[PDB]
Amino acid sequence: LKVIVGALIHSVKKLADVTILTIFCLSVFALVGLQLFKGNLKNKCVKNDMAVNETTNYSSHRKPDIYINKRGTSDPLLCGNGSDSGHCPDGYICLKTSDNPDFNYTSFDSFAWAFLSLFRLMTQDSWERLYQQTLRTSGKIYMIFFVLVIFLGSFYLVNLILAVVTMAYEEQNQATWVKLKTILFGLVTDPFAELTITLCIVVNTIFMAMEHHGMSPTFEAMLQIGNIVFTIFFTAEMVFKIIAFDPYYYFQKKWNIFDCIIVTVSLLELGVAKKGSLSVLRSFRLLRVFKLAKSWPTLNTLIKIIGNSVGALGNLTIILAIIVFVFALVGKQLLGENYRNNRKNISAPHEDWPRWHMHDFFHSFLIVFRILCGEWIENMWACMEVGQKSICLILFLTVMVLGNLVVLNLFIALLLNSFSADVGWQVRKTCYRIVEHSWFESFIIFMILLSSGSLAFEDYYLDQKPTVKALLEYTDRVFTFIFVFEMLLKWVAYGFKKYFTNAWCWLDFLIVNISLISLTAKILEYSEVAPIKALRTLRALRPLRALSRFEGMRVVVDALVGAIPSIMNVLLVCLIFWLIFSIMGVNLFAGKFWRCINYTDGEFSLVPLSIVNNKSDCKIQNSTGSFFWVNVKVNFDNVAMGYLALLQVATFKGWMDIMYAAVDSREVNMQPKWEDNVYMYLYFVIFIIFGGFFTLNLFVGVIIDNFNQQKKKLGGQDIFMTEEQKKYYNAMKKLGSKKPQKPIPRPLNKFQGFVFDIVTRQAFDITIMVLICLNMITMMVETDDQSEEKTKILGKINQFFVAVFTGECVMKMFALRQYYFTNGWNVFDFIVVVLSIASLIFSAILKSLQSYFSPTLFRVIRLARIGRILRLIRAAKGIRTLLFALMMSLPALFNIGLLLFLVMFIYSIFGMSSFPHVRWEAGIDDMFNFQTFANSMLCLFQITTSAGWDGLLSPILNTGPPYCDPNLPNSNGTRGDCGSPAVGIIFFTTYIIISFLIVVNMYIAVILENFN
Amino acid sequence: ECRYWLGGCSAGQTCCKHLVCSRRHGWCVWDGTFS
Ligand SMILES: *[C@@H]1O[C@H](CO)[C@@H](O[C@@H]2O[C@H](CO)[C@@H](O[C@@H]3O[C@H](CO)[C@@H](O)[C@H](O)[C@@H]3O)[C@H](O)[C@H]2NC(C)=O)[C@H](O)[C@H]1NC(C)=O
Ligand SMILES: *[C@@H]1O[C@H](CO)[C@@H](O[C@@H]2O[C@H](CO)[C@@H](O[C@@H]3O[C@H](CO)[C@@H](O)[C@H](O)[C@@H]3O)[C@H](O)[C@H]2NC(C)=O)[C@H](O)[C@H]1NC(C)=O
Ligand SMILES: *[C@@H]1O[C@H](CO)[C@@H](O[C@@H]2O[C@H](CO)[C@@H](O[C@@H]3O[C@H](CO)[C@@H](O)[C@H](O)[C@@H]3O)[C@H](O)[C@H]2NC(C)=O)[C@H](O)[C@H]1NC(C)=O
Ligand SMILES: CCCCCCCCCCCCCCCCCCOC[C@@H](O)COP(=O)(O)OCC[N+](C)(C)C
Ligand SMILES: CC(C)CCC[C@@H](C)[C@H]1CC[C@H]2[C@@H]3CC=C4C[C@@H](O)CC[C@]4(C)[C@H]3CC[C@]12C
Ligand SMILES: CC(C)CCC[C@@H](C)[C@H]1CC[C@H]2[C@@H]3CC=C4C[C@@H](O)CC[C@]4(C)[C@H]3CC[C@]12C
Ligand SMILES: CC(C)CCC[C@@H](C)[C@H]1CC[C@H]2[C@@H]3CC=C4C[C@@H](O)CC[C@]4(C)[C@H]3CC[C@]12C
Ligand SMILES: CC(C)CCC[C@@H](C)[C@H]1CC[C@H]2[C@@H]3CC=C4C[C@@H](O)CC[C@]4(C)[C@H]3CC[C@]12C
């Protein structure tokens, strides 16, 4: 047992420092959340008796809680009194209720609730829900807490966990018969021989990609005769190569035995099976794309990735499946009866069952798969509601902890075992000196940064701000004119060839062009035509000039462009591996998504099976003008819609809405029935395993080895860093390399004599550390519904601890003579004991009622005690080292973060204009919309982690009633309140991909700065 | 008539169990259950 004990201690030791840092940072941010947010989740829009009553209207007051549910959901609308909070509708007041959202489980009102909320924010599990609730109640300007806890903790700590796993493996690797005439007549090998087969596969897959829901019978006949012709072609090729080759030699090879299986399936289904959910076998012909792997090195790499998963690393891919199945077994046996009995509590209002249960063994496997995909909070809420809370808590976290690590561990293992093995000339010189001057660079950067910021103010409310419109209109005109003149100056100074062979001055040639055609169209006629509107929407990419005029921006873009061929190759291989699933899903679910609903109050009710079964039933039961035959917005109805559905399934956003429609689908024109095709969940589990794990592993590996190649080619850290930033990096390394220290001259004089010794004592420092520990637990035990007796005690203890800290700081200032100020961490202690003093004094002054004293300002000021626990970084050497690595990465992190902020700004200015009038449906709220720049930035920060992009795109996908309203009296601009489908698709897909790229850039930067 | 997993049919009759004839080309297949 000593061997397994050593294995366990090593396994924890590799993750010991990162785990301690995770728990410490999570506890600190839990304290921050508790202190700033507490009770604001109990802020429901409780109604008042607005109309007067002759007699008392509070006779009972037992059930006066007239809540108002949020439009499109069965959840009460949250609110806040702050100016930046969410405001109640007319006739309602915001009140402190006694219930938190999400079955009274999502709250910041206590230590444990805050810890769970911060853990969920770390794991990113529907964090945009906690984020939208908190910004609904506390206020928009509190988005800063979420940015801090997303960029740090979540992003950085996932980086640290991933790098710890990678370091542990790499360590592990370091430790490591007249017919013979007809037979030879064959001669299959020929010019264009295998390339006539490759072309046939390409054309056949292109045929299959043209199947859709609304296809003419002639089109379907033409698409079936083509499939018949290609079956004939493949059968021909097979028999003609059987006769040409020897009876054993042909079937000796797996690449010919693969075609044998494919063609025998194509024969034994196209005539021995119907398409009664068996169109998947009709889609077995798509599997012939494996042939192109010989001419496609990246496709061969992906095939080798899958094989290594099933081959040498089968030892770890059999562990994944077996732990999933064991979790499923235990979960079903423990909670299926509770799920069945109490399904009434966790079901939708119109369903007898919840969508996600653990009743069967299939559904328990499915919830375990969802957990490993990274969605556990909602199912944990339902599972805690129905079954025992302690048993539910243990299972869901254990599956999330063990299940996610082994997926990452096998991801890393697969990432190394499959990837590492005259007057004119006078004027020309004048222009040269003018444009090369030091007052022509800082001026242009300032102007670029004032053309950026000027775009943020052109919002929906710009109509309500009349003078701001003219101000912005003439700050844009003058800026574009000055940019045009600056470009003309550069043209006069340098050569046209020197201009046109640069990778940046072209970018700004294009921005100048779009701005100059926009203004020219505005001056001239046709300014109100759709092409000119399209040209004027492109003004959001003007901030790309700061991408050229800043050296860090130049460096980061050049670094990412150095990997453009690898990126494009992986894009091509991923795209076509996803084409197989797109066509397969289209064949499975093409046209089977539509359904009838009841449109009552912006709340859609699925008509029950008894009254409606058909597109024709739903219409013969259209007594009230509220029965609507509508399609699910993300459908497998075309190849394009199929791929937007595949992207949503891979990104795990919009995932459930597709998994439900596909599974419930019975047939075409026939009403969906609950779990009629319950085994389409297996289909989705197979496109997520393959088009998720394996394509992502291929992309990672390819990007890593491109960046490693560039790093070893340059032999320098300046992949993303600058020259001055490299010097600053050297300065920071020197700070870290400062191992020797000068011993302090002990004060010989009696004053400070024994004081210095008692201060520099190990007993003294351990006492201060444990005192910090008690103080941490003291501010940790602080609940919302607390007695005034409890608040007084907490304030008294806070004052005592502040006094003790001030005494220690003054004692060190006295005994240690300016060598206290010599040390940086001692300086941090001094500043965090002068901030605690200032916060206490300010709280006392405000409590004297000098003016209005909002409790939120008291909470903000009370955050100043965060230093008293941030002082504990010294006590943990591992935490100190990881924080030092973070500080080391801050140059490159700042560069790539500024690139990400620039892309956020560009997409924000895009959204502010393309989508202000879209109706609030699922993720768009009065707050989280694209009518003002702050709201746009809230949405874009949210979807930079790809969270809620389905919710923010579904209102865009609306094209008519009952979901939206063409011809709405107000908001006449965007055809009422219906979104542009193609524009929204391009926006959200390109944004999530482009930021997936830039986040991978930050991830690899942090990891390679941790290696050094 | 009643051709099990042969892809026959092509006539005015159907096939017995889990078997129905098809559209376009006339073949009766194991549509009801597995072949
Ligand atoms: C799942 O849902 C059922 C039904 O919605 C819940 O049953 C309800 O449980 C509560 C709490 O025990 C009952 O209230 C109490 O009931 C009795 C009097 O009937 C008494 O102990 C108390 O005065 C109190 O009113 C409630 O009556 C009961 N409702 C029904 C319709 O049975 C159940 O608690 C939920 N359980 C889970 C595990 O989700
Ligand atoms: C969905 O499918 C079709 C429309 O696509 C609906 O067809 C209707 O089916 C009902 C019930 O089978 C037929 O009623 C019939 O009436 C008499 C006496 O009851 C008798 O012939 C049958 O026993 C049957 O009950 C009705 O005529 C038929 N309508 C047509 C053919 O136009 C069907 O109801 C829809 N829903 C379901 C649940 O099948
Ligand atoms: C049951 O009857 C109601 C009441 O007429 C039907 O609602 C109507 O649905 C159609 C098709 O969705 C709507 O037409 C479309 O509306 C807009 C312009 O309003 C535009 O997208 C299209 O050009 C088209 O005209 C119609 O406006 C809508 N009317 C109302 C009052 O809601 C409903 O479709 C019927 N249910 C079924 C299952 O047929
Ligand atoms: C944040 C994601 C988007 C970032 C990029 C957006 C802006 C694109 C421009 C970025 C600047 C860097 C791109 C290129 C870096 C690679 C290095 C610079 O690229 C040089 C190419 O422009 C020309 O390539 P050649 O030198 O092979 O051919 C010269 C042919 N002429 C021009 C002499 C006739
Ligand atoms: C439930 C049904 C649909 C699943 C049946 C499997 C079908 C879908 C396909 C998917 C990928 C295929 C595999 C792909 C490649 C190889 C390697 C080859 O050397 C032997 C056949 C083998 C191992 C194939 C067997 C059949 C296979 C597993
Ligand atoms: C519907 C689909 C399958 C048919 C059209 C896809 C075509 C364009 C795909 C299929 C295979 C692909 C090729 C496979 C391999 C290579 C080798 C690489 O070094 C250059 C690109 C090249 C030559 C690819 C170009 C694009 C390609 C030809
Ligand atoms: C130093 C010891 C106490 C551990 C430090 C963690 C402390 C702060 C944790 C551990 C258990 C937690 C308590 C467990 C249960 C409850 C009941 C809840 O309705 C109010 C908060 C309260 C009382 C929690 C407050 C925070 C708490 C006391
Ligand atoms: C030269 C080879 C052996 C080095 C391999 C070890 C390092 C570089 C590898 C192993 C695992 C890799 C990480 C795997 C997962 C991710 C998350 C992904 O979204 C971006 C890339 C990123 C962040 C990779 C960065 C580089 C990485 C840490």
Residue numbers in the entry:
A (entry chain A): 232 to 407, 651 to 895, 1136 to 1726
B (entry chain B): 1 to 35
Quote what the paper states about this structure.
Voltage-gated sodium channels (NaVs) selectively permit diffusion of sodium ions across the cell membrane and, in excitable cells, are responsible for propagating action potentials. NaV1.8, one of the three tetrodotoxin-resistant NaVs, is distinguished from other isoforms by the relatively depolarized voltage-dependency of activation and inactivation, slower inactivation kinetics, and an increased persistent current; These attributes make NaV1.8 principally responsible for inward currents during the rising phase of the action potential, and contribute to hyperexcitability and repetitive firing in the dorsal root ganglion (DRG) neurons where it is primarily localized. Multiple studies have linked NaV1.8 to nociception and chronic pain. Here, we used mammalian HEK293 cells to express full-length human NaV1.8 and determined the structure, with and without ProTx-I bound, by single-particle cryoEM.
ProTx-I was isolated from the venom of the Peruvian green velvet tarantula (Thrixopelma pruriens) and is a gating-modifier peptide that shifts the voltage-dependence of activation to more depolarized potentials. Processing of the data produced a map with an overall resolution of 2.8 Å from 267,708 particles. Density for ProTx-I is clearly visible in the refined map; consistent with its electrophysiological effects as a gating modifier and previous structure-activity relationship studies, ProTx-I binds to the S3-S4 linker on VSDII. ProTx-I is partly buried in the detergent micelle (that mimics the membrane lipid bilayer). The membrane-embedded W27 sidechain partially inserts in the cleft formed by the S1/S2 and S3/S4 segments adjacent to I702 on S2 and G745 on S3, while the V29 sidechain is positioned directly on top of the S3 helix at V746/A747, likely hindering movement of this segment during activation. Comparing the two structures shows that the binding of the toxin induces an inward movement of the top of the S3 helix together with a corresponding movement of the S3-S4 linker towards the pore domain. This redirection of the S3-S4 linker due to ProTx-I binding propagates along its length such that G750 and S751 now sit directly atop S4 and adjacent to the pore domain, potentially hindering translocation of S4. The higher resolution of this map, likely enabled by the stabilizing effect of ProTx-I, allowed an additional extracellular loop (ECLI, D280-P295) to be traced in the hNaV1.8-ProTx-I map that was not possible for apo-hNaV1.8. Despite high local resolution, we do not observe any density for ProTx-I above VSDIV in the hNaV1.8-ProTx-I structure, noting that the S1-S2 and S3-S4 linker regions on VSDIV are poorly conserved between hNaV1.7 and hNaV1.8.
